[PDB]
Symmetry: C3
């Protein structure tokens, strides 16, 4: 029962996380994390390098918010499909999980292409009747990724 | 418990809806709607225009059935992946929800391409021990879409 | 309740099955099947031919293991997205189900492409407090598929 509850909570979180970004409700995105959080976007191969280079990196909620503010100030259509989560550990109301994802993007030419494929590797805080990310690492396969005014994965 | 029940009902509906179309069981498709229904397929940008042009439009079950009949009479391989649904409102046994989707298509050259990416915006009727669409709007990103003898999204 | 239990078991199985292959934990893959199993990969159109040609075929766990051994001995990045399962029959603790899937692949040029789209047609053994495949047929749309040292779908 407790397993089913955490599974559903995390899968609901991921569905709403994808729709928040795809709908361009970027202001909601930082609220899905705890204040003292970690969000990063790193290439699959870099997750073995001595110095894993993140191409997007936020080590506080303030940095998440800074990104949303900048994206609004210095103003494609995105679509996430996120797989069902695999829970990989439970220590009380802290739950680790992973879920595959693909972000599809449609630009001005009108063709929808695969923009970024990867998997989320997460630590969720399920305390206090809520579901928020303590840490999310987007471990990605696709080489080309936006480096200027990039919308979150 | 009631939330879990509606969530599961809608996610089961979407899984079976995608497989019905992909398997070419087109005769089942109109049965997934109530009689006095609305099905439409509209571009993301048109959902702000003064006159949102739908490229596929049915305002009764009779129109759904008319499409299936025509597709059979005047005879690609499709594959849907549908995200988990986000329930956006509940008024008794009427439930609104949204779910991301991508339809992949394989034509005679054998390459599988992204045909149509979007999100379903739905009103479900969960009354009377059943799950049927009152209305489904497929809000889509991908520019090119079939305009002759188009299979439903 | 029993329906919800089988649904969750199968959807959890599929999530972990995709991640096992994508993570290159190929040694886990044969363990997801019973010993006297059937795994095959067959083109959609061949599922009507008098002699349906399978392009990947294993009729025991020994054959599954033989493939993993060969892949290790004679050494792309893959990403599965698997749809929610539709349960198509239940005879005690043997359950038939189907689920759409797309395997995305990223090769040396760095572009992520659609490698293989299809649906799983499965017979699950849910006896003895466990979830294992009795048979899985991957019925696929995409023409080009690896024929040398192919990683499982
Ligand atoms: Cl920037
Ligand atoms: Cl027509
Ligand atoms: Cl081989």
């Amino acid at each position: 029962e407790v397993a089913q509850v955490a599974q559903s909570a995390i899968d609901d979180f991921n569905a709403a996380y994808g729709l928040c970004l795809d709908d361009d409700r970027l202001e909601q995105w930082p609220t899905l994390f705890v204040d003292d959080c970690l969000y990063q976007v790193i290439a699959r191969e870099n997750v073995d390098n001595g110095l894993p280079a993140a191409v997007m990196y936020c080590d506080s909620k303030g940095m998440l918010a800074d990104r949303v503010v900048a994206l609004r100030k210095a103003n494609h259509f995105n679509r996430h499909l996120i797989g069902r989560a695999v829970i990989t550990g439970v220590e009380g109301d802290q739950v680790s999980a992973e879920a595959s994802y693909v972000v599809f993007q449609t630009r001005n030419d009108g063709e929808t292409r695969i923009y970024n494929a990867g998997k989320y590797v997460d630590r969720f805080d399920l305390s206090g009747g809520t579901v928020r990310l303590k840490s999310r690492t987007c471990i990605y396969d696709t080489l080309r990724i936006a480096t200027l005014l990039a919308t979150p994965i």
